[PDB]
Amino acid sequence: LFAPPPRMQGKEGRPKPHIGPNYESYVKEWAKTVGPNSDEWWAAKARETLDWYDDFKTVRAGGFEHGDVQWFPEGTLNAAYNCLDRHYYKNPKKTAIIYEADEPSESREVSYEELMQETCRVANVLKSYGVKKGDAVSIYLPMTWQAAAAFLACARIGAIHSAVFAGFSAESLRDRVNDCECKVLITTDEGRRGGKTIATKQIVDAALQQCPLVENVLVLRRTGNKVPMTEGRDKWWDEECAKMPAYCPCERMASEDPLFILYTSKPKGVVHSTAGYLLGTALTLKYVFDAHPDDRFACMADIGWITGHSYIIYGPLANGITTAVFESTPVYPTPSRYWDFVDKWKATQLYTAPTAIRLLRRMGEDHVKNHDLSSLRVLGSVGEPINPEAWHWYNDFAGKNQCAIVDTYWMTETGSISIAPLPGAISTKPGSATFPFFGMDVDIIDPQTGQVLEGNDVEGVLVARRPWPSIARTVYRDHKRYLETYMKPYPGYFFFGDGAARDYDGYMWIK
Amino acid sequence: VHHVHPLPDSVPESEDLFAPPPRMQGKEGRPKPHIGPNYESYVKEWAKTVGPNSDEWWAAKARETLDWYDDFKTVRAGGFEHGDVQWFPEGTLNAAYNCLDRHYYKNPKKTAIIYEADEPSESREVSYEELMQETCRVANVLKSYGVKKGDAVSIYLPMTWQAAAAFLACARIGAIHSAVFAGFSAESLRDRVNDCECKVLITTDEGRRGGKTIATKQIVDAALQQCPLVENVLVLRRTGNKVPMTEGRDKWWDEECAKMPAYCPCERMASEDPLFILYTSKPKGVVHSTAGYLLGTALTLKYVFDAHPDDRFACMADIGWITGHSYIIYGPLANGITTAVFESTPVYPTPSRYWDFVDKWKATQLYTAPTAIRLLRRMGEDHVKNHDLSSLRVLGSVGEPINPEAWHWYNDFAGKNQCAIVDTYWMTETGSISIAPLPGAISTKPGSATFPFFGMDVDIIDPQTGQVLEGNDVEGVLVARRPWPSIARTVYRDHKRYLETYMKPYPGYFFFGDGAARDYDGYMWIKGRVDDVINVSGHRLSTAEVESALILHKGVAETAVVGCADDLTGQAVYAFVTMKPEFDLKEADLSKELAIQVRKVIGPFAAPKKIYLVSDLPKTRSGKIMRRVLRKIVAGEGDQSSIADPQIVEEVKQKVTG
Amino acid sequence: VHHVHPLPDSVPESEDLFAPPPRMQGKEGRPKPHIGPNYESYVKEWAKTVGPNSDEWWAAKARETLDWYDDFKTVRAGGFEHGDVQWFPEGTLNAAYNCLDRHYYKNPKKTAIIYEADEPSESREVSYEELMQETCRVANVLKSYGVKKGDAVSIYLPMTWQAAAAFLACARIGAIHSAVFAGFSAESLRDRVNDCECKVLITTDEGRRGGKTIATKQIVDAALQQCPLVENVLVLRRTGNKVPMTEGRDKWWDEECAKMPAYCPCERMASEDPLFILYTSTGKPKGVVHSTAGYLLGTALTLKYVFDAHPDDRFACMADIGWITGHSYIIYGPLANGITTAVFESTPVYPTPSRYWDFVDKWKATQLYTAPTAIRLLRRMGEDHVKNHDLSSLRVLGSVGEPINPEAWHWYNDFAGKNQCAIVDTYWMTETGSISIAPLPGAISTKPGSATFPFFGMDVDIIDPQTGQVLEGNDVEGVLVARRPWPSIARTVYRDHKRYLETYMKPYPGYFFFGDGAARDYDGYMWIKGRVDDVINVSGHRLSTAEVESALILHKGVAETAVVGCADDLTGQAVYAFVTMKPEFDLKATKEADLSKELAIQVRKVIGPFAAPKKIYLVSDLPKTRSGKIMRRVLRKIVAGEGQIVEEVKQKV
Numbered sequence A: 001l002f003a004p005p006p007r008m009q010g011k012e013g014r015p016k017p018h019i020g021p022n023y024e025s026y027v028k029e030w031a032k033t034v035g036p037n038s039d040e041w042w043a044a045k046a047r048e049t050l051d052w053y054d055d056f057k058t059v060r061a062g063g064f065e066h067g068d069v070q071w072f073p074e075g076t077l078n079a080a081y082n083c084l085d086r087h088y089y090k091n092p093k094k095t096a097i098i099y100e101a102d103e104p105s106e107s108r109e110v111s112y113e114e115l116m117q118e119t120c121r122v123a124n125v126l127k128s129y130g131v132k133k134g135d136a137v138s139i140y141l142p143m144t145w146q147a148a149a150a151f152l153a154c155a156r157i158g159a160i161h162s163a164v165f166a167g168f169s170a171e172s173l174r175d176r177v178n179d180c181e182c183k184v185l186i187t188t189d190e191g192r193r194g195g196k197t198i199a200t201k202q203i204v205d206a207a208l209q210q211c212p213l214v215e216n217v218l219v220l221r222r223t224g225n226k227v228p229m230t231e232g233r234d235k236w237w238d239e240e241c242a243k244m245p246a247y248c249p250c251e252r253m254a255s256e257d258p259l260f261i262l263y264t265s266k267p268k269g270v271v272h273s274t275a276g277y278l279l280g281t282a283l284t285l286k287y288v289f290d291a292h293p294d295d296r297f298a299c300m301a302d303i304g305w306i307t308g309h310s311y312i313i314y315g316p317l318a319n320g321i322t323t324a325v326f327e328s329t330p331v332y333p334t335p336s337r338y339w340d341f342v343d344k345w346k347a348t349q350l351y352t353a354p355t356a357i358r359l360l361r362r363m364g365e366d367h368v369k370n371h372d373l374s375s376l377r378v379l380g381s382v383g384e385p386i387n388p389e390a391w392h393w394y395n396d397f398a399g400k401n402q403c404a405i406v407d408t409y410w411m412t413e414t415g416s417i418s419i420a421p422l423p424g425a426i427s428t429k430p431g432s433a434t435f436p437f438f439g440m441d442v443d444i445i446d447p448q449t450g451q452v453l454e455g456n457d458v459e460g461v462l463v464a465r466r467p468w469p470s471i472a473r474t475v476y477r478d479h480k481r482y483l484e485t486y487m488k489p490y491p492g493y494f495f496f497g498d499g500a501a502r503d504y505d506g507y508m509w510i511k
Numbered sequence B: 001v002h003h004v005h006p007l008p009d010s011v012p013e014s015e016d017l018f019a020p021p022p023r024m025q026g027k028e029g030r031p032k033p034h035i036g037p038n039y040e041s042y043v044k045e046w047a048k049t050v051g052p053n054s055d056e057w058w059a060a061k062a063r064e065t066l067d068w069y070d071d072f073k074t075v076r077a078g079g080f081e082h083g084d085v086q087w088f089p090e091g092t093l094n095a096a097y098n099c100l101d102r103h104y105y106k107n108p109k110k111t112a113i114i115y116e117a118d119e120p121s122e123s124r125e126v127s128y129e130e131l132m133q134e135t136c137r138v139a140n141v142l143k144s145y146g147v148k149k150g151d152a153v154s155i156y157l158p159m160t161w162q163a164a165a166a167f168l169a170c171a172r173i174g175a176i177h178s179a180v181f182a183g184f185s186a187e188s189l190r191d192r193v194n195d196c197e198c199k200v201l202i203t204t205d206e207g208r209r210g211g212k213t214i215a216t217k218q219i220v221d222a223a224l225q226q227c228p229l230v231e232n233v234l235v236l237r238r239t240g241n242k243v244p245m246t247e248g249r250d251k252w253w254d255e256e257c258a259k260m261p262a263y264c265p266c267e268r269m270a271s272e273d274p275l276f277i278l279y280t281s282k283p284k285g286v287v288h289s290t291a292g293y294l295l296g297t298a299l300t301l302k303y304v305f306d307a308h309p310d311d312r313f314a315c316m317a318d319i320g321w322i323t324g325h326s327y328i329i330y331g332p333l334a335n336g337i338t339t340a341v342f343e344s345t346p347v348y349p350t351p352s353r354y355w356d357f358v359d360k361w362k363a364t365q366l367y368t369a370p371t372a373i374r375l376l377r378r379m380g381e382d383h384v385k386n387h388d389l390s391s392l393r394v395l396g397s398v399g400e401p402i403n404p405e406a407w408h409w410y411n412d413f414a415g416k417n418q419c420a421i422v423d424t425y426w427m428t429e430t431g432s433i434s435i436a437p438l439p440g441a442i443s444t445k446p447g448s449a450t451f452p453f454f455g456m457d458v459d460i461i462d463p464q465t466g467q468v469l470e471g472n473d474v475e476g477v478l479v480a481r482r483p484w485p486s487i488a489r490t491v492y493r494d495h496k497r498y499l500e501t502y503m504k505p506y507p508g509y510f511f512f513g514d515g516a517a518r519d520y521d522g523y524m525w526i527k528g529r530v531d532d533v534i535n536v537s538g539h540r541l542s543t544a545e546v547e548s549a550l551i552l553h554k555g556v557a558e559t560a561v562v563g564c565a566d567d568l569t570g571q572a573v574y575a576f577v578t579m580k581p582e583f584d585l586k587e588a589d590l591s592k593e594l595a596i597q598v599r600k601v602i603g604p605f606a607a608p609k610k611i612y613l614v615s616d617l618p619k620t621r622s623g624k625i626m627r628r629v630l631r632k633i634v635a636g637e638g639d640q641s642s643i644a645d646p647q648i649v650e651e652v653k654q655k656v657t658g
Numbered sequence C: 001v002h003h004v005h006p007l008p009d010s011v012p013e014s015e016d017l018f019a020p021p022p023r024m025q026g027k028e029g030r031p032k033p034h035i036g037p038n039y040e041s042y043v044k045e046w047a048k049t050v051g052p053n054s055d056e057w058w059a060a061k062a063r064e065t066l067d068w069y070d071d072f073k074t075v076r077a078g079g080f081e082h083g084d085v086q087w088f089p090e091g092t093l094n095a096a097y098n099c100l101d102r103h104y105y106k107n108p109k110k111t112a113i114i115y116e117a118d119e120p121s122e123s124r125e126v127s128y129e130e131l132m133q134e135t136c137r138v139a140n141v142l143k144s145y146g147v148k149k150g151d152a153v154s155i156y157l158p159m160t161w162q163a164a165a166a167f168l169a170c171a172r173i174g175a176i177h178s179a180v181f182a183g184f185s186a187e188s189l190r191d192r193v194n195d196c197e198c199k200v201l202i203t204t205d206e207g208r209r210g211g212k213t214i215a216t217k218q219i220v221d222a223a224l225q226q227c228p229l230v231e232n233v234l235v236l237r238r239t240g241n242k243v244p245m246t247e248g249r250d251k252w253w254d255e256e257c258a259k260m261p262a263y264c265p266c267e268r269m270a271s272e273d274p275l276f277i278l279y280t281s282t283g284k285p286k287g288v289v290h291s292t293a294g295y296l297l298g299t300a301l302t303l304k305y306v307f308d309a310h311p312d313d314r315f316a317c318m319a320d321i322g323w324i325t326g327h328s329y330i331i332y333g334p335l336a337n338g339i340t341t342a343v344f345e346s347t348p349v350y351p352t353p354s355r356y357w358d359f360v361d362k363w364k365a366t367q368l369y370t371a372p373t374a375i376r377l378l379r380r381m382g383e384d385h386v387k388n389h390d391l392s393s394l395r396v397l398g399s400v401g402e403p404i405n406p407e408a409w410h411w412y413n414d415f416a417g418k419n420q421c422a423i424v425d426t427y428w429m430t431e432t433g434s435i436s437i438a439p440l441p442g443a444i445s446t447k448p449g450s451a452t453f454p455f456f457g458m459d460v461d462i463i464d465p466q467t468g469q470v471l472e473g474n475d476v477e478g479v480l481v482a483r484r485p486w487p488s489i490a491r492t493v494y495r496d497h498k499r500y501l502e503t504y505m506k507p508y509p510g511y512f513f514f515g516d517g518a519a520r521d522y523d524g525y526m527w528i529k530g531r532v533d534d535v536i537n538v539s540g541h542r543l544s545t546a547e548v549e550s551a552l553i554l555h556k557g558v559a560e561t562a563v564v565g566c567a568d569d570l571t572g573q574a575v576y577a578f579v580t581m582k583p584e585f586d587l588k589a590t591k592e593a594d595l596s597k598e599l600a601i602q603v604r605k606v607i608g609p610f611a612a613p614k615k616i617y618l619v620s621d622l623p624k625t626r627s628g629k630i631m632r633r634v635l636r637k638i639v640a641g642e643g644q645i646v647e648e649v650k651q652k653v
């Protein structure tokens, strides 16, 4: 066990946590977010967290059975306005993105103003190509800060972006491009990671040879090395944006308009809508990571995955804080890079996968023991169970046993963290996600019985009892596959696909 | 000394007045009427809805009745002269939101549609949840075809419940639906599909009505060979019989919808955005806009039929005509009540069908047409006399004048003398009911529409004089003084025809095209189309008044009178007469009895010069008597395909020319 | 004593200050000024509109002046450096609603347009009802061609009242209109049509201007042979004479409109959606883009305050909708205010040079707005055309387009105004959207040739082009800059934002650069001296075109002049003058040599000895654009040797 450490109780001049100090304080608030009286909390949270063009009237409707989940349906908003414009109007020079380049010397801070201006220019480029509200746009970009401008330009005009991880092959890119039927692709000339050159345009050129709908390719000049360019079809990002004004109006989006598709391994195009997803990411960032206005949030994932979607771009920028976009690897130049980064920028949270937490602990304690790491308050794990040898090391060499460790469990289809400790309220057990997040009423069902095994010291499949705002709404042009995979196996429930157990202490353990 | 006479009736005028019966007085546990309990309560509310200070009532009614995304500022503007009528123009709303979403959110399992299939066993209740989900899937299918706000979508569907989902899916996204009655020939379909220039058509494999199979998909294919703009066809699998499916163009409804999410956002529509095009009988595309039309249907449904939240409204018309647009789909669903989609005919499997339907579902109101009333009246009382039917409180009649004889049969046997009868006058171009009794307030006369609805200020003009005839006991052509919210806004891409037809004949007025009389008590009588008058020796006759006289004779089921030129009287009346099957047939003596009764009740100038006793009248598939055919046959123009049974035409030619 | 001099004038400076006359004082039954009665009343209101606390006033004026569908939250944002200017960004509205619907709802029979046809008898009044219905019909026609929000639509229409309907039909549905002056060549039309990539073009069969025919449809057909994207052409039947019509592509306005309803909904536009592109004529055609709310607010406010417009005024701007002046002060400005605006189809000299004054007395115009070129044309025609007219309905007379010489200014004040009108010399540009510097007629005492003081929201300064630094205080001369964005500034150059930044934002970083020379005199009055590019540096003495031309016109029988610089080895540059004499002048009686001597002598007395021209050319007319601006770049290169009025000038040179 490990109760909330000094940095998560207001001591040493730190911000006091939003939920604290004990489990009773967490349960008091979470109880407001589930059950038949939880609309009130969700309605206020919706109106306090997001800027709306038109208010909503209904909080929620629909359910798992037919896949017609609705949240704040009559409201209209825009994700770019909430992640850029509204913070730009309040503090234009605040840093939105810490761009940590592959080479450390090339890093620099990108203000909300600069990010909004680039987003507006790209939005104007997409409009000049004929991209309309509801069209899909594919994005094949590595971890340069302009990836955020690419996402938010699509959201700004109501286009649906579909991000394709920049390590995917020509065939995997082709499949995802063809499935979403985008007519525009946004990519780079080359990607730079761990000191090597990704030939992204070369992969794009070979992929597009079997992509008959793509008519326009916008190419970011990331390296300037000679890459092939197809006349008419291919245009340079900087040359196109130079022609455009640095402001663009926001399309007024219905709450349930699709915000993006994310193909997850045939590739299944997981579709998230606008307000519910945006709310879930902003509330999870705030409470699960205890974000405060001046925080510098360092999520080391990739924007090609949902972790990059929710916890690099949408979550942090919606909260108006600073977010890191890390271009390199955990061990380039040396295995100390994560900590070189943490002290150089004074990151207040770090968020990473157990895979990397174990490629660092394997590289030796010499790379972490002589750093400050004092700016960190919360350390986060995501993607896979953290072995108890990894949990203790991340607490020791990364937190100096003074940061809370949040084991966050979720999936692409949940949009936002489902079960995790709130670091100022929950005492952690290594390898446990502990209690479920606001809006997540989870239970355990016996697969041999189809019956929920109530109580403690139980084990079975993990399910959810009621829809939550950030839940994925469909699988793109394959709603049947959406109902069969998540909704058919346990009627009245959502089926995560993961086994789980709840021990005597009520703590959840994800198998 | 009254110059205006009621439609011929066998009941004395002094005993032919019908006050709201106990079921419409808040007795017997029935809901109390919204407007009651006498005429002055009608006038009291009506007076707030016309004239220089009616904006306040209409602004308030609009905001109470409909859920708006954005409020309106202006209540009304525009006018007849240039056809620029506007209502609530700055407001935005969506018709599918008002007909589905807002009721789904309140009571998702409440029944939206009683789907009464052709085969009675296959009937079932469709919840607001289920109808909304199917509406959103179809809307999502339409968007995947590139249907945008303001695009036309043709609909060629019979009376299954999915037809409501087709209408509402178009409105959900701001597309303009153009519904085509599923009984129309390939040529009529083609003409409508081309005129509206839609790129998408929604239809069935087949339809089932009265136990026969309608080969809609086959008809579609013949039409589409002459509709170059149609790219997508969405085919509902209603029967499952093998039908042709053109690769690429044609997709199955259930297969497309299975790919799509069960919710879809609503397009935020301006008040004056076109909601639909409805062709009449070149085909004239009557355009209605959104807020004023929807408000019109919701208010008339509520007040003309005294609808209350648990009512099960049984309008037996077809969504292919305005009666089904306004009083099956939009009016009843906007009010959040339960509405019937009746897939069958009134006499299938037997003429007991309406009454089986009423008691099975405890229908609270019934709304049908005089041809159906006369059709069941013909088949006798065995099929109706032994039902309860006490769930009914209001019985409606629409489409033509209802002969008093038929009115009394409706009142005696459908209503067991315990329902109010609402004779509702209106047209496709008026959007909603223009003149009718409010059934908790108005004392009814058989054959009279009585008094104008909220927002309708109607007068009678002497057509020779062009001036309004002030007062009572007057006769002329019906006109409306000011625009009302649900009036048609244009004729599709033919605004000149719209102004020339309704707005030019009497400037400052809307011209209905009907002759009308207001009697001594102020009751309005719709007598017929202006174009259909018979002039005999200077006496102008409506067909309805002579036909009402003929049906007072025992054994008569239905008649159609026509005028024919005459050298000494200008025209003469000719009558085609239909008898109940039970009547014992001699023919020459019955015909003389019929002519004598017309001369006694109207005058010798109305007496048919000749009477043709036929076994059936020529009727279209939609049920109307084919009067032009009868006229042209009497006129010697026998050699000059809407006919439901063409063998009848030869039978009529034989009896006239043989 | 003063380093900055007024433009040379025959009147002594101490009698040359003109307080608001009684028509502008609320006497004789005239409306009381919105701002008055003196300089301090102007300053008191103007201080609310600039500086770090001016949001409150702009938010109030925006909500009071325009009808909004959605309110805004942010008043202003962005700046010159990147060209991301935003005003009222979250608000939504529609320009057609604001110029038509809301006035139609209140008083439908009020006259929106006084249509003054080429022939005076063919003129008539167009109600707000009639104009709204024609706008809605055309908007419905455009929607039937598939025009969507954000599409561009070219307009090649002469000055008939339907030009306003075509602009507003585009605004009504959110299309971006691109108007092209109806006299432009086919090659000029082609370039503008292709640049904006429109698929629809609105035009006439023919235009009528001064009894001459404008083969608009013939010119169009030539242009469209090289315009591949244009699919639909809507042809107004202005004359009904036989013009070619291409089957399918071309349709008749009246036949299309007759099929359409006479109401059409308004598209809900964001504040910063583009309203129109307007191409200007030193390089390629520059497509200046204005957005919706700020531009409309600016034209509405300037119309109200610079011309002191009141609800029943009959505003007579004599420009052409092909230029920004007609955009701002014929259509959008006056119709947003709900008043009556004039659409004048003729020329100032058709039928007689009394047309303007015939027009003014026929309609009882309350304000007149025209250009110095027209003023100096009527001047040379003689005063009998104006002398025996009433003209008393007038309260404000305005001048736009170029520096107005004091000689022209007094002729305007004495004859057009009978010394009872305020003269408002209005300085601005296509790129400013609306009037930038002008007298407020109920408050400001005018000097002949001074624009006087900045408008609400305009915070201007003078920079020394030789140092890049602002000149502090009064009695200074340099180049005019603005310190902050204003609501109606142009947002970009269409698909060429880099040219927008390089031209306006980069010359003096931190400021907006107008490209004009200017001086702020000892009283704080601003004087616009000419274009920076037209300045002539004679041995260090920087001479502006306006002051030398204003000197030359003080000579008897001089009608109009242009001076340009060319390099001379001794003085670096020397002044070269092209002079136009009134047509009655006897060129044989006066040897041109003695004319030159008296002219060069007259220049030395008002400006200085360095300012005399090195050579004077007598010409019959000067090279001018279709707008009327003198094409001094042509004269400068022709004088520099580098080669129909141009062939006459080159031969004479």
Ligand SMILES: CCCCOP(=O)(O)OC[C@H]1O[C@@H](n2cnc3c(N)ncnc32)[C@H](O)[C@@H]1O
Residues within 6 Å of the ligand: A264, A305, A306, A307, A381, A382, A383, A384, A385, A386, A407, A408, A409, A410, A411, A412, A413, A433, A496, A498, A510, A511
């Ligand atoms: C988490 C988003 C990254 C990619 O998301 P994805 O590719 O959709 O995969 C989701 C799967 O990650 C596993 N997982 C996630 N967090 C935990 C945790 N804290 N403890 C144990 N397992 C975890 C689950 O098995 C889940 O199903």
Ligand SMILES: CCCCOP(=O)(O)OC[C@H]1O[C@@H](n2cnc3c(N)ncnc32)[C@H](O)[C@@H]1O
Residues within 6 Å of the ligand: B280, B321, B322, B323, B397, B398, B399, B400, B401, B402, B423, B424, B425, B426, B427, B428, B429, B449, B512, B513, B514, B526, B527, B528, B529
């Ligand atoms: C009304 C909806 C279906 C028909 O709509 P439509 O096809 O546009 O027919 C309009 C014409 O039907 C006649 N009509 C209609 N209802 C009545 C009535 N209650 N009493 C007398 N005549 C009536 C009129 O002549 C009218 O003008």
Ligand SMILES: CCCCOP(=O)(O)OC[C@H]1O[C@@H](n2cnc3c(N)ncnc32)[C@H](O)[C@@H]1O
Residues within 6 Å of the ligand: C280, C323, C324, C325, C399, C400, C401, C402, C403, C404, C425, C426, C427, C428, C429, C430, C431, C451, C514, C515, C516, C528, C529, C530, C531
């Ligand atoms: C203003 C609309 C018509 C021309 O619009 P434009 O074609 O954008 O011309 C812009 C240039 O016109 C000159 N100019 C304009 N008005 C004045 C004035 N009152 N005094 C002195 N000069 C003036 C300037 O040099 C300006 O830069």
